[PDB]
Copies of this chain bind each other. A is one copy, B any other.
Amino acid sequence: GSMTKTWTLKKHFVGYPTNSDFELKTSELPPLKNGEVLLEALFLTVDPYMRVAAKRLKEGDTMMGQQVAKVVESKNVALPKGTIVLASPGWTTHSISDGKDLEKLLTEWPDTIPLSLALGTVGMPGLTAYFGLLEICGVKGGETVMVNAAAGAVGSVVGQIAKLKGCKVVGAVGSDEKVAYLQKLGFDVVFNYKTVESLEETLKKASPDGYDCYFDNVGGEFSNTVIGQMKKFGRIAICGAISTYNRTGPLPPGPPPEIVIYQELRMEAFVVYRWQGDARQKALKDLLKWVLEGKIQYKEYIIEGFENMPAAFMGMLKGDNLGKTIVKA
């Protein structure tokens, strides 16, 4: 009896996604069964991983993704109308759930921050920065950390956790606007990797001593240069490689194995969902407390309208976003 809107993949991406690769559909959801609830999207997220996972989708399928939603119709006594939850039905305005696949927000979640932070700094990207930096990289204080995409959802949290842990932070971003923003946040050195005369010279001057840690979101040639300036036994958290997600040809060369061996680098990739239970719960509480204390400032790149969700995904891949990209329903 209820209607919904859903973004589906009409055509597989070639290079960057385009508007014609998506198709909006209006359908009628089935009636609720006993124990089910109807969820209305309040905020939806778009994330770089969707560019990679989309290739395993079939044409006509719904784009994957998480959202903050509220119950608008309930046949479940535990989930009354008004309940806020995180759910991953994909790019859709309304969806059916039985309760098992839903996640309530932290009990201490205050009204002083937008619910949309549950998809960002106090959500999956913030957890990625938390464990990638503190556990994979293992910063203990005083290290020099290189982080790229430093003005995005993950990188901005990485740099600010590093600063509050007593580290020096060198950040790479793709616009002068992002450089200014992170400078205001207090990052030690920030530069626009698109306009540097020499990426090697820039990284050398940013830290003549080398780099203890590298939180890598970009991959590709950029990371080959960073590897040449890691300290011996330096540590790389392989978080992402967004410079390759939209590639049409072969991957770029790897770093010269001469340098990798001499540098005896430890390089570990990770997926945020590895951490669950009490470890995950504790990381969310730390992130919430740091936001409320101002040690982590949040900024959101809000795109208004479900109909503009493809445009938000496409823009984020191209760096339009300063901070977590969010679609307000």
A interface residue numbers (CB < 8 A to B) = 11-12, 14-16, 18-21, 52, 174-175, 194, 219-221, 238-241, 243-244, 246-258, 260-271, 274, 311, 314-315, 318-320
Q: B250, A253: Cβ atoms under 8 Å?
A: yes
A12: chain B residues at CB < 8 Å are: 194
**In the complex, which residue of chain B has the Cβ closest to the Cβ of A270?**
B264
Residue in contact with A251 in the complex, picked from B20, B238, B256, CB distance below 8 Å: B256
Q: B254, A254: Cβ atoms under 8 Å?
A: yes
Q: B257, A265: Cβ atoms under 8 Å?
A: no
**Separation of A256 and B269 alpha carbons in the complex (Å):** 12
Given contact pairs A194-B12, A249-B252, A269 touches B258 in the complex (Cβ within 8 A): no
**Separation of A41 and B129 alpha carbons in the complex (Å):** 51
A314: chain B residues at CB < 8 Å are: 18-20
Residue in contact with A15 in the complex, picked from B15, B174, B274, B311, CB distance below 8 Å: B15
Q: A269, B274: Cβ atoms under 8 Å?
A: no
Q: How many copies does the complex hold?
A: 4
**In the complex, which residue of chain B has the Cβ closest to the Cβ of A265?**
B269
Q: A248, B15: Cβ atoms under 8 Å?
A: yes
A18: chain B residues at CB < 8 Å are: 16, 18, 314, 318
Given contact pairs A15-B248, A194-B12, A265-B268, A21 touches B318 in the complex (Cβ within 8 A): yes
Q: A14, B250: Cβ atoms under 8 Å?
A: no
Q: B271, A262: Cβ atoms under 8 Å?
A: yes
**Separation of A251 and B244 alpha carbons in the complex (Å):** 14
A262: chain B residues at CB < 8 Å are: 271
Beyond A15-B247, A262-B271, list 14 extra A-B contacts (CB 8 Å): A11-B319, A15-B16, A15-B246, A16-B18, A18-B318, A19-B311, A220-B248, A241-B257, A244-B258, A247-B249, A251-B253, A252-B253, A261-B271, A266-B266
Given contact pairs A15-B15, A269-B260, A318-B21, A251 touches B249 in the complex (Cβ within 8 A): yes
A238: chain B residues at CB < 8 Å are: 257, 260-261
Pick the 5 closest A-B CB pairs, nearest first: A254-B254, A241-B257, A251-B253, A15-B16, A249-B252
A241: chain B residues at CB < 8 Å are: 257-258, 261
**Separation of A86 and B109 alpha carbons in the complex (Å):** 64
**Separation of A174 and B20 alpha carbons in the complex (Å):** 13
Q: Give the distance to chain B from A284, nearest Cβ to Cβ, in Å.
A: 21
**In the complex, which residue of chain B has the Cβ closest to the Cβ of A320?**
B20
A254: chain B residues at CB < 8 Å are: 251-255
**Residue in A12, A20, A246, A315 whose Cβ sees the most chain B Cβ within 10 Å:** A20
**In the complex, which residue of chain B has the Cβ closest to the Cβ of A233?**
B274
A243: chain B residues at CB < 8 Å are: 248
Q: Give the distance to chain B from A318, nearest Cβ to Cβ, in Å.
A: 4
A264: chain B residues at CB < 8 Å are: 268-271, 274
